[PDB]
Design a protein around this ligand. Structure first.
Ligand code: CLF
Ligand SMILES: [Mg+2]
Ligand SMILES: [Mg+2]
Ligand SMILES: [S]
Ligand SMILES: [Zn+2]
Lengths: 111, 461, 464
């Protein structure tokens, strides 16, 4: 299994942020958390300027720590690979939690 | 694949509610329909919308009259049935209030009967200054305007504050609608109607925890150690007026995203308060939650000290239970969220394999979560009914079932022990210590001489 | 001695004594073999009552809902009833009886239950030509009466339905017995008394097997034992013995009117005199003698009670709450053993009946002290009287009053329904001679423990 398979399987089994109540919140979280994961895994400073950024950092830090613990490759891998991988992971999470989810509430404007 | 159980051959519409996860499937093709109408006559486990408002959320509050506008049964039925202690002598469990609707009220209206009952309740208990009024089936049907009545009482009694909920039992399909109506009404009417002193640089609400057997009070030991002020608990060991101040918090930490995600989502939209979803059951999950909370606030090292202390205190006992529970098969037949909070945590921390799960009222979102975290070969059931439970037992042969007491008492006849997945056996079950308590009860349930004795027929040589 | 009746002075209720009518109709139905009640209304009306039964008995009982939702609440629920009947029959091949129990919601919206039964009968005769399913309309609006009245209504409707279908035939030689709303242990006792007297009887409903075993073969035996055939045979009885004015006597009256089965209503058999009088009436109607074994059980009870009455019970003030037959009967028992039942609370709107109960005059002629009987009472009325200074030595009532006694530090004996906060009470008789003995010993043991915990002459429990 590929590196991207390992990331996807980890997110699906562990994380909750991709399963928020509505499409817009899932989109916001998939983008926000994974951008922070990419900073963390390539040794860049995370964004911590706004409350929302600081939440994305909190969720991303767990993920980044767990992937470095679980997967040998995740230490001993590139930068341009985090980019490739996170682009793929975003697309895969949007596909399974949004595009092809049959959860009928996802586009309800009203909470 | 989806499963048509034998007992459902005459209600074949149930197939779309039951998923058996199999290898290589794209689970997006197999998500159970959830939160749909109940089939009459099935012995579904479901309850009503009023339950979701009064019993589950509003009634947890320590300092509030729970005025049920309806005939007396709805009140009787929601009294002596919950285990949510408080630190004020359990006022919330000791009392229930009814407007004792009679036929004349059905015919000519119940608004004056409600007004009088409200005054009475305030007069009887002059130290109590807060109330929630709930509609029930017949007071909804006749169109009583409980908001109007509450506004008049408030004008006549400037010492009180009253909130109203329209939640007849036939609304929605289950208790879920009661959660929704209460959440949305509270944020629209009562949030931002008061403020409290802020005493910490770190503030949060804790959203969707109802203090079952003291869960909230146990978690509070963590927040106090970390120096985090909880502006409001929604609603475990809570007060009415704390809930009025929820807009003040820096962070909303959510456990029960089913009952209480609504208000977290509206607090984010209206006030910008971020929503953090955690798991406050599970040992390793509890650590992850504390680490996320501490990362948000910039107090990582404090969180690590707490976690290290709690691991040293409780991890050895957890591991003792793991050695003994490894491989045991569990079913979880509860409301919904505990399926996705527990399937992987009991697997990770206790070695226990959850073989069947049923959700009374969960939404498709709850099924997304549980199937993501759950095992292959497990049954995932939306709106399960009694005969299905028997068939599932035959299929998966659980060693222990986490469910309510009445179902526990049923499966005892089949020699299957239970733990009360709702109100607990010997809780609390949240947090580090709480998962040990869960494990202990599971162990005692299964490691039980009575089960073996019951199988012996003394007439056999 | 003045016995004063008064109503609750509040419109609202705080801490209701009883549940609503549908709950009692469910209790009546679960005592019938091959019966699953169908409660027409919202889901809570079913599920909360299944929980209540699990609290009292620590068992599951099968009751189904029609699952009224918003559509049906606006446009009518007849299709929910009709579907629910069919779903039941399809999935439970051995089902024979379905009391269709109305709720506040379906009474307000005016669903026509009898019409839905015609529809269902046609559908069931077509789909299941070899089965017979009895559908009984049970009208139980919750905005009248209480679970006491709903139990009585459900028994009456099920008996009307089944006996309408079968009519009168061969005399059976048996008594019909309506004990009312009692525990399995009470039914066990009555069965023993009829057996020792050589009197054949059906007890309606026969709930003995609610206390079901955990068996090697994993079978489930938690069912009512009263069958269709038993119920039908009530038209053929020698006589009806009705023990409870408010919990089945109206069925005995219906069988008298319809089938000329003479009904004998007696005082509910709590205490010695009431049990004597029940056995006298049994002897009179059957021509059978009371056996020596019952004189002996009586004597054993009296011996036990005599060890307690003047020593521990005399002059002690008691409050009693529960079903009206139980409250009135326990007050009579209490006076036999020198207790003083000064406050009796009865929990529903039936005060015009209770004022005419002959036991009120019986209590007036035997009381050495004033009695207050509060009708339409809630349990706040008890708590508020204690808060105002009423000094009680004992409370007798069901478990939903427990916090009143715990907080006031008053010993309390658990009687009536539900008794969830002690173990095994459903198996212990309260009626009859054995039951009087068992009640008296529970009272003494509760006082004894209280003397210990409070250090109140705890040294005296040595040579009594
Ligand atoms: S579904 Fe829920 S519990 Fe049911 S009535 Fe409706 S709000 Fe209430 Fe109430 S008084 Fe009794 S229990 Fe019912 S029949 Fe009415
Ligand atoms: Mg996976
Ligand atoms: Mg003796
Ligand atoms: S529910
Ligand atoms: Zn052992």
């Amino acid at each position: 299994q590929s590196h991207l398979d390992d990331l996807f399987a980890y997110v699906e089994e562990r994380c909750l942020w991709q399963f928020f109540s509505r499409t817009w919140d899932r989109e916001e979280n998939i983008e926000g958390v994974l951008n922070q994961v990419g900073r963390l895994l390539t040794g860049q400073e995370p964004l911590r300027g706004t409350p929302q950024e600081r939440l994305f950092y909190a969720d991303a830090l767990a993920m980044a720590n767990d992937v470095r613990e679980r997967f040998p490759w995740a230490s001993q891998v590139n930068k341009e690979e985090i980019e490739f991988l996170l682009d793929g992971l975003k697309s895969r999470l949007v596909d399974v939690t949004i595009t092809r989810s049959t959860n009928r509430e996802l586009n309800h404007h009203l909470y | 694949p989806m499963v048509l159980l034998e007992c459902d051959k005459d209600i074949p519409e149930r197939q779309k509610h039951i998923y058996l996860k199999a290898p290589n499937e794209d689970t997006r093709e197999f998500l159970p329909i959830a939160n749909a109408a109940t089939i009459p006559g099935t012995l579904s486990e479901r309850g009503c919308a009023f339950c979701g408002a009064k019993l589950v959320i509003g009634g947890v509050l320590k300092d509030t009259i729970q005025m049920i506008h309806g005939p007396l049964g709805c009140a009787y039925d929601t009294w002596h049935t919950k285990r949510y202690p408080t630190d004020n002598g359990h006022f919330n469990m000791k009392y229930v209030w009814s407007t004792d609707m009679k036929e004349s009220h059905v015919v000519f209206g119940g608004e004056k009967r409600l007004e009088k009952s409200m005054h009475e309740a305030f007069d009887e208990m002059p130290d109590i200054k807060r109330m929630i009024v709930y509609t029930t089936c017949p007071t909804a049907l006749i169109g009583d305007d409980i908001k109007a009545v509450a506004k008049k009482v408030m004008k006549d009694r400037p010492d009180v504050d009253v909130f109203t909920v329209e939640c007849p039992g036939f609304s929605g399909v289950s208790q879920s609608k009661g959660h929704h109506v209460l959440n949305i009404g509270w944020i629209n009417e009562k949030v931002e109607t008061m403020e409290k002193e802020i005493t910490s640089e770190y503030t949060m609400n804790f959203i969707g925890d109802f203090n079952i057997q003291g869960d909230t009070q146990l978690l509070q030991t963590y927040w106090d150690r970390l120096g985090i002020q909880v502006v409001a608990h929604f609603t475990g060991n809570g007060t009415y007026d704390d809930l009025r101040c929820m807009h003040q918090a820096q962070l909303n930490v959510v456990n029960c995203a089913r009952s209480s995600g609504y208000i977290a989502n509206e607090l984010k939209k209206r006030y910008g308060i971020p929503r953090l979803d955690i798991d406050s059951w599970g040992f390793n999950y509890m650590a992850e939650g504390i680490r996320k909370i501490c990362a948000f606030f910039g107090i990582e090292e404090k969180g690590e000290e707490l976690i290290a202390e709690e691991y040293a205190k409780w991890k050895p006992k957890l591991d003792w239970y793991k050695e003994r529970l490894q491989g045991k098969k569990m079913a979880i037949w509860t409301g919904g969220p505990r399926l996705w909070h527990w399937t992987k945590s009991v697997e990770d921390d206790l070695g226990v394999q959850v073989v069947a799960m049923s959700s009374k009222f969960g939404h498709e979102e709850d099924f997304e979560k549980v199937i993501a975290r759950g095992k292959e070969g497990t049954y995932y059931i939306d709106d399960g009914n009694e005969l299905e439970f028997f068939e599932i037992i035959d299929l998966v042969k659980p060693d222990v079932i986490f469910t309510g007491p009445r179902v526990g008492e049923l499966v005892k006849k089949l020699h299957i022990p239970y733990v009360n997945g709702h109100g607990y056996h010997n809780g609390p079950y949240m947090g580090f210590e709480g998962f040990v308590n869960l494990a202990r009860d599971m162990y005692n349930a299964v490691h039980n001489p009575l089960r073996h004795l019951a199988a012996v027929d003394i007439r056999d040589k | 001695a003045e016995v004063k009746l008064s109503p609750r002075d509040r419109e609202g209720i705080i801490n209701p004594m009883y549940d609503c009518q549908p709950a009692g109709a469910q209790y009546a139905g679960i005592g019938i073999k091959d019966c699953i009640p169908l409660v027409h209304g919202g889901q809570g009306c079913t599920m909360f009552v299944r929980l209540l039964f699990a609290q009292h008995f620590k068992e599951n009982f099968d009751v189904a809902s029609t699952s009224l939702h918003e559509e049906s609440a606006v446009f009518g629920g007849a299709k929910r009833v009709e579907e629910g009947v069919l779903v039941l029959a399809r999935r439970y091949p051995n089902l024979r009886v379905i009391p269709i129990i109305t709720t506040c919601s379906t009474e307000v919206i005016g669903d026509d239950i009898e019409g839905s039964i015609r529809v269902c009968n046609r559908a069931l005769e077509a789909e299941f030509p070899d089965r017979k399913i009895y559908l009984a309309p049970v009208h139980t609006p919750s905005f009248k009466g209480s679970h006491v009245t709903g139990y009585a209504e459900c028994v009456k409707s099920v008996f009307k339905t089944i006996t309408d279908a079968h009519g009168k035939g061969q005399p059976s030689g048996k008594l019909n017995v309506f004990p009312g709303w009692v525990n399995p242990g009470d039914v066990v006792l009555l069965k023993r008394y009829f057996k020792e007297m050589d009197v054949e009887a059906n007890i309606y409903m026969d709930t003995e097997d609610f206390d079901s075993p955990m068996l090697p073969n994993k079978s489930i035996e938690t069912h009512g034992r009263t069958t269709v055939e038993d119920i039908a045979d009530s038209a053929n009885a020698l006589a009806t013995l009705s023990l409870a004015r408010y919990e089945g006597n109206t069925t005995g009256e219906l069988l008298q009117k319809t089938f000329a089965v003479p009904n004998a209503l007696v005082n509910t058999p709590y205490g010695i005199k009431n049990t004597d009088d029940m056995l006298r009436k049994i002897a009179e109607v059957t021509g059978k003698e009371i056996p020596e074994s019952l004189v002996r059980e009586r004597g054993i009870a009296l011996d036990a009670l005599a060890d307690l009455a003047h020593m521990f019970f005399a002059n002690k003030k008691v409050a009693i709450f529960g079903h009206p037959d139980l409250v009135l009967g326990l007050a009579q028992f209490c006076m036999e053993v020198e207790l003083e039942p000064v406050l009796l609370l009865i929990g529903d709107d039936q005060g015009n009946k209770y004022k005419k109960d002959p036991r009120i005059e019986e209590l007036k002629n035997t009381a050495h002290f004033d009695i207050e009987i509060v009708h339409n009472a809630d349990l706040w009325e008890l708590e508020k009287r204690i808060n105002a200074g009423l000094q009680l030595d004992l409370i007798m009532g069901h478990s939903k009053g427990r916090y009143v006694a715990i907080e006031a530090n008053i010993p309390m004996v658990r009687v009536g329904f539900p008794t969830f906060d002690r173990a095994g009470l459903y198996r212990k008789p309260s009626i009859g001679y054995q039951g009087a003995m068992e009640l008296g010993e529970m009272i003494a043991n509760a006082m004894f423990a209280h003397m210990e915990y409070t250090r109140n002459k705890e040294w005296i429990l040595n040579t009594w």
